[PDB]
Design a protein around this motif. Sequence first.
Motif, mmCIF file in Angstrom:
data_model
loop_
_atom_site.group_PDB
_atom_site.id
_atom_site.type_symbol
_atom_site.label_atom_id
_atom_site.label_comp_id
_atom_site.label_asym_id
_atom_site.label_seq_id
_atom_site.Cartn_x
_atom_site.Cartn_y
_atom_site.Cartn_z
ATOM 1 N N UNK A 1 8.450 -3.241 1.860
ATOM 2 C CA UNK A 1 8.195 -1.802 1.915
ATOM 3 C C UNK A 1 7.917 -1.236 0.524
ATOM 4 N N UNK A 2 8.700 -1.646 -0.476
ATOM 5 C CA UNK A 2 8.472 -1.183 -1.841
ATOM 6 C C UNK A 2 7.211 -1.793 -2.441
ATOM 7 N N UNK A 3 6.956 -3.081 -2.187
ATOM 8 C CA UNK A 3 5.718 -3.684 -2.669
ATOM 9 C C UNK A 3 4.506 -2.964 -2.088
ATOM 10 N N UNK B 1 -0.737 -1.891 1.115
ATOM 11 C CA UNK B 1 -1.155 -0.479 1.188
ATOM 12 C C UNK B 1 -0.497 0.352 0.093
ATOM 13 N N UNK B 2 -0.765 1.664 0.037
ATOM 14 C CA UNK B 2 -0.269 2.447 -1.099
ATOM 15 C C UNK B 2 0.006 3.888 -0.653
#
Length: 277
Positions: free
Chosen positions: A115-117, A124-125
Amino acid sequence: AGVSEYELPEDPKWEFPRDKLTLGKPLGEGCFGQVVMAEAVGIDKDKPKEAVTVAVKMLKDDATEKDLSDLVSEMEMMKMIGKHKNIINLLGACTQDGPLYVIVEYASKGNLREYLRARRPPVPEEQMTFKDLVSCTYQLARGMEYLASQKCIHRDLAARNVLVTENNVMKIADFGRLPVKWMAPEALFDRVYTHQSDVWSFGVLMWEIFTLGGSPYPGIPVEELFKLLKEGHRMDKPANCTNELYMMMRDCWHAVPSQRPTFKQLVEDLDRILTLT
Ligand SMILES: *C[C@@H](C)C(=O)Nc1ccc(-c2c(-c3ccc(Oc4nccc(C)n4)c(F)c3)c3c(N)ncnc3n2C)cc1
């Protein structure tokens, strides 16, 4: 065999209709056991007639009598543990008249590491900010405080075993082949788990959070990891990090366990920072 053919499963009020349950895709490889996304109905007790996504822990194909006994003991543990905001809480069960299923909450958002990556600023971002990070760390610390309250031990405490629901709320998992980097020197060398080892594991987790899914001790082989740790080699400060939080991390990484910050002390400090958002 698997179903109770010579076994003694009591009847609780936790049990959920074997009928309304309907299993689905299995989520990740099960270090704690084969877990499957199920689509239960009428387990909230307030929202019937509509499906709710949950996770159920069935037995493995090569299950042994001890595997089933361990599963039921773990179920009873969950039943005793109680309810907290940031923990994978039991929601139901399937005990009498059929195979054993253990219903636990479902997290829409994947593991924290992934999730953090995927929430990294320019996988995605979705824009991520330090304010959200600090809230995450405080929530996790409060959850860990409660988890330590019931004197439970965490097999593999890492962002790879922490979950997030659609509500963007942190939850622990694993509170009931080894992660060497997440283990304290005392636990890595005496192979004994203690709350101070949990503080070290939590500090390693904080580092993993602050870097948005980085591997701790990168480029350091496991064989000499302990030796480097013994010489006082602690991890560096994350890039987008503050020195005060890093000092809390290093304190969590104190070689001596006695002086390490207590779980409540960490919760107090994190609340202190959160007030200055
Ligand atoms: C070891 C490693 C490679 C790994 O992948 N671990 C891992 C597997 C599965 C999930 C997971 C869960 C989930 C469900 C049930 C339990 O059991 C449990 N939880 C807390 C305490 C105790 C004693 N047992 C889990 F630990 C994790 C899950 C859920 N419930 N909903 C959605 N998605 C989920 N995933 C990915 C996590 C880590």
